[PDB]
Amino acid sequence: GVLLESQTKITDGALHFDGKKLNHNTFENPSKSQAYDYFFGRNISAHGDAVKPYKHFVFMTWYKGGKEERNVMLSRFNTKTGVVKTIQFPHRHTGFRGDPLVGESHNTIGLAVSPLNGTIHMVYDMHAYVDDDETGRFKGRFVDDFFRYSFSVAGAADVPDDEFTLEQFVKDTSELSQGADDYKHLTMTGNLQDKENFSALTYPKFYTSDDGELLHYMRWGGNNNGAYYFNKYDAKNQKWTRFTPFNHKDQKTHGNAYNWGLYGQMKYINGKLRVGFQQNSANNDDRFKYQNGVYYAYSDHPDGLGNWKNVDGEDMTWPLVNSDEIKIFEPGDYIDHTAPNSVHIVTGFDWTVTENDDVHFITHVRSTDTKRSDYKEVSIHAFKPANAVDFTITTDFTGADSIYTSGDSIFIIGLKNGYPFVEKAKGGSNDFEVVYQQASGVKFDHGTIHIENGKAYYYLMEKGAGNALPLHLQVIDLGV
Ligand SMILES: C[C@@H]1O[C@@H](O)[C@H](O)[C@H](OS(=O)(=O)O)[C@H]1O[C@@H]1O[C@H](C(=O)O)[C@@H](O[C@@H]2O[C@@H](C)[C@H](O[C@@H]3OC(C(=O)O)=C[C@H](O)[C@H]3O)[C@@H](OS(=O)(=O)O)[C@H]2O)[C@H](O)[C@H]1O
Ligand SMILES: [Ca+2]
Ligand SMILES: [Ca+2]
């Protein structure tokens, strides 16, 4: 029953890093040519939490194309009329550590629209930025601008197409305003005293609760010392709460044997705030070069403020200090190496929970040393049916980067030879089948997905040369 219901071009020129990959030794001599060099990956548009359906619209964010442009953009697509109206913001992608010549793929444009009062929310262009000066890592380039929040008056999301302009959005008019085209707010609470609470964050991601409340979470910190922080939109007062931690930072000072970072996602699923991740311990003497384990917890509090529990319903220390409390299993156990740093876990992790409360995790493990003779590589699917005691754990699985769910089913959705495909399985099972594979039309380089209404919103960038490429929105019915 899977089928493409619409494909809609949004622009001919969104930003893309088409230049050379830089590193620690080279990033300070980026090309001044027409090619746009980058430091991590090439993707920045149609990337991250950049697509949201709201009533009969779909809102999308992107970076204006052209190495020399880079403006934050917001588009609203009218599903009934076919009209795509775009707003161009003044802020331009500031690049790796604030140098626009080096593309920075972390700095996505997160987006949300409040069902309660029709305000629009955007957090963007952020990668652990703090206040510092000429001698710091960031050379003073983010002072009074390390958290970048833009948002509209009430009702902006429903205004006629002629009124959907930058005039719908609220200026920074505080003591720290950088001027007349300052649309970036340093906090979401409206109180600059809260500013340290918004420092050093990455990865803006929004959810809507079952009662229409906007939730938001970001990641503080780095590789082996990080935390998830989450907050809530007060639509009545048109402001957000301060950020609250899922786990403590600097766990080793809060009672843990080691500091650890997190690689995973918080998600609002089945009407609860939940988290699934692999940890990255600061210990460099054990067998895991980077990540290890699979962890999961959920909150019985509507806003996540306490009452956390692990998969077995046991109370979790909160904010969490010791990840052991919520560990499900060790992907490391599926490879035989035990020597220090011999086990490599980074890509291929995600998780989901079905409407029937089937819990699913996917992961990937390989030998650190790819040249060894007994090299090993497995993909893992760990899943527990609703009415099951234990998890079923299998390496009879091809691997994936994401897992999705809708209704009774789980899905794997991505690109194969430039075209979207969908694989589907019953919730609580490992029985995946390809049920959809686009086979004609322009091909795509990358994209990002949002599931809702039994549909996948696949926000995509078309393949091509240069650093200004077209964007298309595909709406795919999953047919559940
Ligand atoms: C957290 C670190 O803290 C300090 O070291 C410092 O602030 C540093 O950032 S820095 O100032 O720029 O150097 C931070 O180090 C990077 O942090 C990233 C993070 O988790 O925030 C890490 O990026 C994640 O993992 C990357 C591997 C991923 O990159 C994609 O995947 C791969 C690959 O698998 O080989 C290659 C490409 O880099 C890219 O396509 C990141 O993706 S993202 O799209 O850029 O967001 C991200 O998931 C990063 O590895 C740290 O070194
Ligand atoms: Ca500002
Ligand atoms: Ca380690």
Side-chain angles (χ1 to χ4, degrees), residues 21 38-43 47 96-97 104-108 127-129 137-138 202-203 219 221-224 262-263 346-347:
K21 161 67 171 295
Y38 59 100
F39 193 84
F40 301 104
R42 306 182 177 277
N43 301 344
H47 185 50
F96 183 69
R97 291 183 198 177
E104 171 53 284
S105 50
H106 289 84
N107 295 6
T108 56
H127 188 187
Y129 302 147
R137 192 197 297 275
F138 301 129
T202 308
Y203 300 125
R219 193 209 199 254
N223 326 282
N224 50 47
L262 310 75
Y263 289 80
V346 178
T347 60

Side-chain angles (χ1 to χ4, degrees), residues 53-101:
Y54 167 83
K55 297 191 194 180
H56 72 280
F57 302 104
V58 181
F59 294 77
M60 286 149 273
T61 58
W62 46 287
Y63 286 97
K64 190 186 177 173
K67 183 188 191 190
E68 265 82 53
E69 301 290 3
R70 308 188 311 281
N71 297 81
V72 170
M73 315 292 275
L74 169 71
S75 304
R76 175 181 85 182
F77 174 25
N78 184 321
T79 205
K80 318 302 252 65
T81 71
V83 173
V84 171
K85 200 58 179 326
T86 299
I87 296 174
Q88 176 175 308
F89 287 74
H91 179 83
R92 304 164 69 210
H93 176 53
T94 56
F96 183 69
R97 291 183 198 177
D99 176 10
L101 287 167

Side-chain angles (χ1 to χ4, degrees), residues 279-299:
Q279 80 165 8
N280 193 292
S281 168
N283 183 1
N284 297 330
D285 289 334
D286 68 358
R287 76 190 66 193
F288 305 99
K289 197 180 186 178
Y290 300 113
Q291 291 151 42
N292 78 276
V294 170
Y295 304 82
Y296 165 85
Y298 61 96
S299 177

Side-chain angles (χ1 to χ4, degrees), residues 144-145 172 176-178 182-186:
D144 308 334
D145 197 38
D172 185 349
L176 303 183
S177 182
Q178 305 175 292
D182 193 347
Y183 282 86
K184 294 175 283 176
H185 295 268
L186 194 55

Side-chain angles (χ1 to χ4, degrees), residues 2 28 55-56 63 79 89 116 132-133 155 174 191 233 237 243 252 296 332 347 369 378 392 397-398 416 454 475:
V2 182
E28 294 188 294
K55 297 191 194 180
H56 72 280
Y63 286 97
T79 205
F89 287 74
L116 303 178
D132 70 344
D133 62 3
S174 69
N191 194 335
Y233 178 51
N237 292 316
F243 276 120
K252 71 174 179 199
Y296 165 85
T347 60
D369 178 5
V378 289
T392 297
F397 181 61
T398 68
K416 180 171 183 288
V475 181

Side-chain angles (χ1 to χ4, degrees), residues 237-354 356-370 372-397:
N237 292 316
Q238 287 180 80
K239 65 180 57 183
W240 296 73
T241 56
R242 295 172 44 97
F243 276 120
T244 297
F246 165 76
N247 65 289
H248 282 119
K249 53 199 216 189
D250 304 298
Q251 304 93 333
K252 71 174 179 199
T253 70
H254 290 88
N256 210 44
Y258 51 86
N259 287 343
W260 44 282
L262 310 75
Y263 289 80
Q265 298 180 60
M266 302 194 88
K267 309 183 179 178
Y268 188 83
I269 295 232
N270 264 12
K272 294 182 182 169
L273 191 56
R274 313 174 187 257
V275 69
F277 65 95
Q278 301 181 133
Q279 80 165 8
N280 193 292
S281 168
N283 183 1
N284 297 330
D285 289 334
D286 68 358
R287 76 190 66 193
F288 305 99
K289 197 180 186 178
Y290 300 113
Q291 291 151 42
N292 78 276
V294 170
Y295 304 82
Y296 165 85
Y298 61 96
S299 177
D300 283 343
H301 188 283
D303 306 323
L305 301 171
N307 304 120
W308 285 85
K309 304 187 200 294
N310 68 13
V311 74
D312 292 319
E314 301 166 320
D315 295 318
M316 182 200 85
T317 303
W318 174 75
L320 181 59
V321 170
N322 186 341
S323 55
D324 285 347
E325 301 188 22
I326 61 170
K327 194 174 194 183
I328 294 182
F329 80 101
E330 180 51 74
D333 295 345
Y334 290 80
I335 184 171
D336 251 275
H337 321 316
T338 59
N341 302 298
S342 58
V343 176
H344 187 282
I345 305 172
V346 178
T347 60
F349 172 78
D350 195 11
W351 65 277
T352 195
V353 172
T354 66
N356 200 31
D357 222 73
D358 308 289
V359 172
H360 287 266
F361 303 95
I362 57 171
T363 181
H364 182 76
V365 193
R366 68 159 172 91
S367 311
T368 296
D369 178 5
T370 51
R372 61 187 303 172
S373 60
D374 50 341
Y375 173 84
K376 305 304 164 39
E377 186 164 8
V378 289
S379 290
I380 298 163
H381 183 197
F383 60 91
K384 176 176 143 289
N387 293 310
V389 286
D390 301 302
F391 276 75
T392 297
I393 303 179
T394 172
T395 64
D396 184 0
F397 181 61

Side-chain angles (χ1 to χ4, degrees), residues 196-235 237-256:
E196 205 62 55
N197 181 252
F198 292 77
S199 178
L201 299 179
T202 308
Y203 300 125
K205 180 66 180 289
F206 293 90
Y207 297 96
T208 311
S209 69
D210 284 358
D211 292 325
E213 317 271 347
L214 295 184
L215 295 165
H216 179 56
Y217 92 103
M218 296 189 71
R219 193 209 199 254
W220 173 96
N223 326 282
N224 50 47
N225 182 7
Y228 290 156
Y229 287 86
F230 53 94
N231 68 347
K232 180 180 155 188
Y233 178 51
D234 183 351
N237 292 316
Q238 287 180 80
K239 65 180 57 183
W240 296 73
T241 56
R242 295 172 44 97
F243 276 120
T244 297
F246 165 76
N247 65 289
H248 282 119
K249 53 199 216 189
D250 304 298
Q251 304 93 333
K252 71 174 179 199
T253 70
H254 290 88
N256 210 44

